[PDB]
Amino acid sequence: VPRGSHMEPLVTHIYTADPSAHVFDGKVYIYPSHDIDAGTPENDMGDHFDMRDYHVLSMNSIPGEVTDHGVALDIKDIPWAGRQLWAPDAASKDGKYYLYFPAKDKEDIFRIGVAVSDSPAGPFKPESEPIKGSYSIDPAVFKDDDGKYYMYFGGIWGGQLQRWTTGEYAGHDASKTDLEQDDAPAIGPRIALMSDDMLSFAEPVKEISIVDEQGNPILGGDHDRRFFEAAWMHKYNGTYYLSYSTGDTHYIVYATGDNPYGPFTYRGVILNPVIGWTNHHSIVEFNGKWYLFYHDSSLSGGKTHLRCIKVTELTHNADGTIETISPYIE
Numbered sequence: 001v002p003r004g005s006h007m008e009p010l011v012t013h014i015y016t017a018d019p020s021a022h023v024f025d026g027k028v029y030i031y032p033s034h035d036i037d038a039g040t041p042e043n044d045m046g047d048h049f050d051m052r053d054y055h056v057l058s059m060n061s062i063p064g065e066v067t068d069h070g071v072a073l074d075i076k077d078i079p080w081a082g083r084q085l086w087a088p089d090a091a092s093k094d095g096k097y098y099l100y101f102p103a104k105d106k107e108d109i110f111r112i113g114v115a116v117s118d119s120p121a122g123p124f125k126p127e128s129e130p131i132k133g134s135y136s137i138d139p140a141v142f143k144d145d146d147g148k149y150y151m152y153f154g155g156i157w158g159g160q161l162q163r164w165t166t167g168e169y170a171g172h173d174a175s176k177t178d179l180e181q182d183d184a185p186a187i188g189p190r191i192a193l194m195s196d197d198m199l200s201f202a203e204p205v206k207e208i209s210i211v212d213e214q215g216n217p218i219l220g221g222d223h224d225r226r227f228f229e230a231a232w233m234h235k236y237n238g239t240y241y242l243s244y245s246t247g248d249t250h251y252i253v254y255a256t257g258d259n260p261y262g263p264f265t266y267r268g269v270i271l272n273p274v275i276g277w278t279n280h281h282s283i284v285e286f287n288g289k290w291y292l293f294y295h296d297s298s299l300s301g302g303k304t305h306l307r308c309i310k311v312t313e314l315t316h317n318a319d320g321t322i323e324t325i326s327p328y329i330e
């Protein structure tokens with residue numbers, strides 16, 4: 001039956017989170033986390049998010065019937081992975097499809113790997129090692145209009161980005177949160193141009209600057225605006241939109257720039273806080289309409305680790321501002 005008309009859950013047979021939406025073969029393909037009730041301890045390092053596989057979803061229209069294509073990748077078949085298959089993303093190039101995914105390696109360090117298929121629905125064959133020079137979580141692979149592909153990535157707290165300031169892991173006894181310098185600039189998300197074969201980075205990883213309207217860096221203590229996780233890139237009017245989750249303040253916010261690397265100037269809120277602690281999204285154009293894919297914990301009765309994905313229309317103004325969405329108003 002058709003789904004996605006009144007911000008209802010898009011699927012109810014499994015718990016779903018972290019929706020990354022793409023238009024491939026004229027259909028919407030969604031690459032979400034598959035939440036499970038693992039019963040692991042709950043904490044600020046995210047051990048309660050103990051996902052083990054990915055199902056790819058697709059829609060021919062919005063609203064529309066949502067197809068669950070089954071397990072596209074299982075952690076048991078990723079040779080380098082130890083635990084925790086967190087939010088994935090996909091890209092298409094030269095008739096191949098690439099699934100990018102964060103997982104903890106056998107030293108319990110988040111890395112980002114790639115898996116390859118001939119179909120947007122998978123299943124995907126993982127590379128035996130993660131991407132060299134990758135770390136942390138939440139990849140978003142963005143195809144720019146010039147044909148260049150960039151991976152945006154990173155997440156603080158349990159995503160470990162705060163432990164990577166020197167390009168080597170600071171250790172399991174390092175900061176559990178951020179730089180612990182609230183009057184210093186906040187940690188920024190990461191970006192790298194992808195190699196032609198889509199399996200590696202084509203440059204040393206860069207860090208993105210996010211500034212306020214006066215041009216000053218967003219500070220570590222500014223939790224309403226500083227980067228937490230879930231970077232996403234989209235373009236409108238030739239402007240680059242970096243949107244992201246603020247984590248402990250529960251917003252999706254956005255910042256605008258004139259090129260993939262930024263700097264990006266904080267503009268405002270995309271999505272106000274939802275039911276459940278986490279907030280994670282993507283923004284996609286389909287048949288000339290823009291959509292915000294997001295999640296909440298409504299289906300599970302408010303359990304933070306058992307989520308369901310939803311969709312709503314997103315409105316850009318011609319000046320490039322975006323109207324803030326509040327999830328439970330209409």
Ligand code: NA
Pocket residue numbers: 020087089138139140230231232281282
């Ligand atoms: Na994302």
Ligand code: NA
Pocket residue numbers: 268269322323324
């Ligand atoms: Na606003």
